[PDB]
Amino acid sequence: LLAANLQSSMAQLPMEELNRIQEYLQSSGLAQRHQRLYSLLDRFRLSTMVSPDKDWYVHLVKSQCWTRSDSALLEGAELVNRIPAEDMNAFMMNSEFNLSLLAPCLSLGMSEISGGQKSALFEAAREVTLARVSGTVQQLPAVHHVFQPELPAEPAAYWSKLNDLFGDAALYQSLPTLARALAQYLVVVSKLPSHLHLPPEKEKDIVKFVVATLEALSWHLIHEQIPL
């Protein structure tokens, strides 16, 4: 379109279509994935006419760690480890926090506990893991029925509610993400200091969550394919 005569190329690609394509490539983020293409499109438009303080650091870490991503999690865990202990819990408990950081955070924090020192990161990540585990168990039906792959025999009272809870995308993706963090805590809980052992008020919620996670994985096999 640039090499051809302009009076033909302006008829092949109108300015309203060029502006639609430009806006779409930015809103989809495909402009950052294909920078050569976007540069050539804006060329075609031209041819057709600080102080680094605490709160700056918290804004910097937020730009990485309040996302959805799995790309740089060990580096992301080290960044939240330098957020002050009095800011950590509210930073992790926010809706926008990346739940994929919780296992890295427990693993990094355990390496401080096994070094003979207190870990504020381990304490915050453990409390957030347990609070989120209880917070999703509260959304299950109040009376549990056995999962049986052959027969959803109790439709209105129960299996309709599970078909709304599993397959939601937003909820289903959270369960094995939290289960990675809960497993990272449960594999260390016998090695931990006495006050960091499992709360006796959380033991039923933990069994309900574990059951619901294998039920969600089984539901995904039936309605879709092999889980990740």
Partner: protein
Amino acid sequence: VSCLEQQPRNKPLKALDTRFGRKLSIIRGIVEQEIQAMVSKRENIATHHLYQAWDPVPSLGALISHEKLLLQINPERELGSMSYKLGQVSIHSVWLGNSITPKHRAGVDIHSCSQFLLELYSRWILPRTPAILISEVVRSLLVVSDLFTERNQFELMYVTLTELRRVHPSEDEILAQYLVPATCKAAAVLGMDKAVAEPVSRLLESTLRSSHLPSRVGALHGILYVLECDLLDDTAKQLIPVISDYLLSNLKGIAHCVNIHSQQHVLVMCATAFYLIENYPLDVGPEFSASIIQMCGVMLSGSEESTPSIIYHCALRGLERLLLSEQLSRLDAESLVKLSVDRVNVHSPHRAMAALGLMLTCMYTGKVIVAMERVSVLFDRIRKGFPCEARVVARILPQFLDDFFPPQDIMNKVIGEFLSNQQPYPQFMATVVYKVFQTLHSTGQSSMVRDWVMLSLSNFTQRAPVAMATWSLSCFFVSASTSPWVAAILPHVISRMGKLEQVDVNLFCLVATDFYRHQIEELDRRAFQSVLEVVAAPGSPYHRLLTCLRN
């Protein structure tokens, strides 16, 4: 949840309580955690989590942490193998746990079981009784005696077996392999007085000649039990010479081609030699120690095919204990340092990672340019190792530098190995440069950071891609910083290594600015802009930063 108790034969090392011993425990603890993750059999771990190694060794009680068993697990056990082996519990543990020296496991009364079985088995092998069953009953005694808890149980077993030895035919094979180690285990718990020692020595010495290989391996476990005793001189001057001749005869032949030979035979022979060198250093012959170290070196200098991985780790972890044991003569200890460096330079990550552990214990046991020939092996292993090796070599390197050198002697190498086009892992080297510069800021030595930043800034602007030159400088100005909130961002810089978006330029400008506001006199403040102006072409990050400095 559980696997069988181990109580190993080797005591905690005192060398690790010293000032340099404590520093060795941190660095060799990093290398241990990675050897475990890479080659452990993981037999007591169900889940994928890499750093969950533990051993079934209770405080003679709660489990002793893997950190605190560092070179204590028995050499002839394969790494992470939790299966029953002849040798599970040491005689010093039978004595210390039962308060005998020459009953309830988990609510269960094991005294009742072991008492009942002694009564059955003694009456059933000493009546006219099936030969197919005698060996299986004596196997049962050899195993079940790990549960025995009163001295009269071992007395009854010793009497029963020494009767069975004169009752049963002299042409036997399938019994002897249980009878020898069971008799020696009993005799060893009974303390090797002259009333028991001469019978036991005569059984051990004669059964080392047995054609059946399990009868020899059983004799060698018998020897490992009796060597825990405070032996009488008249036994030590006669028994120890027979063991050392048997070891030098059978190891010196096989060492060049180990994989042709049975693994448990080589592993038990090494374990005897290491226990003899550590605990009987004056009594064992002058060619011993030296000759063992040489023929273990011939095993380590083999190929991935001729020396199996489990035997490689056994021989190495044994030699590594012998050097932190103070008991070597200096010519043996110095010969082991010469054997170590030639085995770091190999293909396989796990064989090299183990040889690195050995080199570290040598260098912290030796506490002037010869250390520099060692540090260049660590930098070479970052350059030519797989990522799983190089990331581990890069984690230990800051402490190795700080423990063996004045900073000035290695500051040239640290920055050059981060800048080199032959560096595959500049993001691993960034954390080394950081930990070296932040150490200099902790020791009040901040002037040396002003110097080495400015002395090297023109090497950084000669990085070939502009993304890799804008990066690297962002690592350098983060590593040099005195502001804690700037020194915190290095993981955010490391995660963005290939990138050149507007935020990657803005960060470079900010972190270079704050160094220019808070750490750079006019002669430096000008020369910094002069080295920058050479690359300040109209669109470059250096032009964008020169505007921020020049205002």
